[PDB]
Amino acid sequence: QTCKNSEYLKRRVTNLEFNYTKPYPNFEASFVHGVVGQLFQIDNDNIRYATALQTCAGGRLFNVVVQDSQTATQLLERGRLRKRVTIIPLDKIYTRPISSQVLDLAKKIAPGKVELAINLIRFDESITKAMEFIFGNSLICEDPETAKKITFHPKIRARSITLQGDVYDPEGTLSGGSRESLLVDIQKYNQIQKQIETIQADLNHVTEELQTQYATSQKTKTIQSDLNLSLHKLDLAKRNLDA
Amino acid sequence: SAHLKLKEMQKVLNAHRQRAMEARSSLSKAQNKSKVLTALSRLQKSGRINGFHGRLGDLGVIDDSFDVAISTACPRLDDVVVDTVECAQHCIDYLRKNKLGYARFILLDRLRQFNLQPISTPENVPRLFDLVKPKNPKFSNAFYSVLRDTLVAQNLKQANNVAYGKKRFRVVTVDGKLIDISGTMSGGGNHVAKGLMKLKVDDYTPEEVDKIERELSERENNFRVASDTVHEMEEELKKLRDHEPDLESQISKAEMEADSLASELTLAEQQVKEAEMAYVKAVSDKAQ
Numbered sequence: 335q336t337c338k339n340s341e342y343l344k345r346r347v348t349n350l351e352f353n354y355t356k357p358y359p360n361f362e363a364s365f366v367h368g369v370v371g372q373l374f375q376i377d378n379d380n381i382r383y384a385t386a387l388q389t390c391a392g393g394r395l396f397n398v399v400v401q402d403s404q405t406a407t408q409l410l411e412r413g414r415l416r417k418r419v420t421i422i423p424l425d426k427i428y429t430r431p432i433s434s435q436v437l438d439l440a441k442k443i444a445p446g447k448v449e450l451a452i453n454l455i456r457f458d459e460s461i462t463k464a465m466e467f468i469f470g471n472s473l474i475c476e477d478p479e480t481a482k483k484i485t486f487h488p489k490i491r492a493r494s495i496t497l498q499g500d501v502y503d504p505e506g507t508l509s510g511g512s513r514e515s516l517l518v519d520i521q522k523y524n525q526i527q528k529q530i531e532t533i534q535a536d537l538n539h540v541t542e543e544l545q546t547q548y549a550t551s552q553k554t555k556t557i558q559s560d561l562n563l564s565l566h567k568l569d570l571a572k573r574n575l576d577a
Numbered sequence: 578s579a580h581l582k583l584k585e586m587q588k589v590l591n592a593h594r595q596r597a598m599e600a601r602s603s604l605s606k607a608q609n610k611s612k613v614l615t616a617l618s619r620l621q622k623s624g625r626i627n628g629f630h631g632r633l634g635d636l637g638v639i640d641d642s643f644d645v646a647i648s649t650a651c652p653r654l655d656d657v658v659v660d661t662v663e664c665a666q667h668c669i670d671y672l673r674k675n676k677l678g679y680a681r682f683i684l685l686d687r688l689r690q691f692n693l694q695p696i697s698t699p700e701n702v703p704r705l706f707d708l709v710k711p712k713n714p715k716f717s718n719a720f721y722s723v724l725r726d727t728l729v730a731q732n733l734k735q736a737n738n739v740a741y742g743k744k745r746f747r748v749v750t751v752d753g754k755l756i757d758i759s760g761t762m763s764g765g766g767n768h769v770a771k772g773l774m775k776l777k778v779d780d781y782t783p784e785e786v787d788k789i790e791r792e793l794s795e796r797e798n799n800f801r802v803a804s805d806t807v808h809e810m811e812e813e814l815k816k817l818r819d820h821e822p823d824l825e826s827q828i829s830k831a832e833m834e835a836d837s838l839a840s841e842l843t844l845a846e847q848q849v850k851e852a853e854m855a856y857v858k859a860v861s862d863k864a865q
Binding site for chain 2: 344
């Protein structure tokens, strides 16, 4: 019922869908971890930053993770490319960190109206380095004037994001306009998917223990034939009591 | 097989779905630029705003034969060029008040300048920066901020120099193939890109998108009623798989109860003739 009544939302969550054709059957599909979209989630307070979140990922929301370089290249070559996408291998992506000193300095200059991108996301530890490559170079500021004065700071080169969806790049680049917020439906979608997977695993374990119980019940029916014979003998004896 | 066919056709729907989205996305982008152009025609004409330069495409012209090259190289030629921060902010919030589109902007006051002088480009590769003829040289440095390491290669020589030679640059092939320095695997495809600088237009009528949406909706409804019929057939199969064992157990117990009744009848039918003979031999006694 849940997996049948929740596909009207799938008409909106369509660009995040992954599609490919397996070039090599011997290749381990575990190396293709999938799209970066469903591989991570966001906590509750991120709702108040929901729109901003899109910016912090941009088109990077549509990337697929691969383990090494050669496998990614051969999958791209023999995978029957259909649409222009972007793929991220894990072996060669460099992780550029940001000095936390300037971070805490800007946090102290602007009390309260400061947030960190890596602190407002939930992901797997095994791909933390990937977060250092995508979500490890952005910041969030609430008030627009605070982000404006932070952008104009020489030493504080912060990749700020004003909650109205205003990217304050350290080089003065600024966006604006009405696009929309397609993260809440993707969050609901991946939550439904994870609960479906949990229920399916539970049902598979129940079905396996049911097959074990069914073998035990086959043996118990082998003995239940004689049990029924004894029950018929009991009924005959009860009838012969008054016969 | 029925539900198999179901999944088959529903897979097709998914394809249609995404492809429709693709078209829709393009359409949106198109219409976005359209309404953006309206601002570029209106806000600059009224004269109430100042310092509004316009778009990056309203600048120096590049060679027409490399239109696809510059189209696949960088879309930031559609960036909004303005000078002051406050004017950009106020028109941004005025556009957001009425929801008149969405794009990116750049400020001239915060444009980090560099050296626009050319560098040695061996193997006879042309630099598109020198090919541009800007009407305002003061913006040429800004071009160097935008067109960073812009080169052009061909004849599949990218594996020698563009891959790794003396230094990796953002070289764009004459047909549209781009090799980025960031290292990420750029997934290729068959997307069209042209018509950005005249020294392309793949627009479709809104009725086409409307009929695509209508056929998507009717296909979704057909597949939903097909899944409903599949569910009804599965419920019927469950009813059959529940009505088989209870009926077999009831026929077993019925034949057992019939055998018990038959045994009771066989053991009791002798009492009939026994009591009949007893009554006869009692009636025959008539001495008393």
